[PDB]
Amino acid sequence: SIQAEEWYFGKITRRESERLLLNAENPRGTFLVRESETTKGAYCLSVSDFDNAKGLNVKHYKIRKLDSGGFYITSRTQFNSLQQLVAYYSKHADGLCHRLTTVCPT
Ligand SMILES: *C(=O)c1cccc(OC)c1OP(=O)(O)O
Incomplete structure (x- = not known):
């Protein structure tokens, strides 16, 4: 059950995900x-990043x-499973802006 997951925010907009992730x-x-x-059937992994060029910013996959x-x-x-995917990317940055670290606070 992906909906049981605390990192699963379900039906929220991209703007809302950015609002939650752009916290200093x-x-x-x-x-x-x-x-x-x-995209029906597709999920979106929203991730925060930070650098001196862009400062705090958000990427979507x-x-x-x-x-x-x-x-x-x-x-x-x-x-x-979605859970295994999340676990793998919590260890490997691969092509992502950063490895997954902590669940976005509400
Ligand atoms: C996920 O599906 C996703 C990936 C890449 C870019 C965006 O939006 C910028 C995105 O979110 P979406 O809700 O528009 O699909």
């Missing part, structure tokens, strides 16, 4: 997963889910 107290990698605004079963951001790297 959020370190790099603060994140949440929400439904995509327009589409998470696909196949009827065939797998969840992924890139088709080359798939998982059996």
Whole structure:
């Protein structure tokens, strides 16, 4: 159950995800997963970042889910569940702006 997950914010808008993530107290990698605004069946991983060029900012990554079963951001790297995907990206930055660190505070 992905809805049981504390990092799953469900049906919130992209603007709302940015409002929650653009809090000065959020370190790099603060994140949440929400439904995509327009892609049916896809989730969206919203992640905070920070650098001297952009300062505090937010990145969004589409998470696909196949009827065939797998969840992924890139088709080359798939998982059996959204939870496993989140766990993998909490250890590997790979192509993301930062590895996932802590769940976005309400
Ligand atoms: C996720 O689906 C996603 C990925 C990349 C960019 C955006 O919006 C900027 C995004 O959020 P969405 O709700 O528009 O799909």
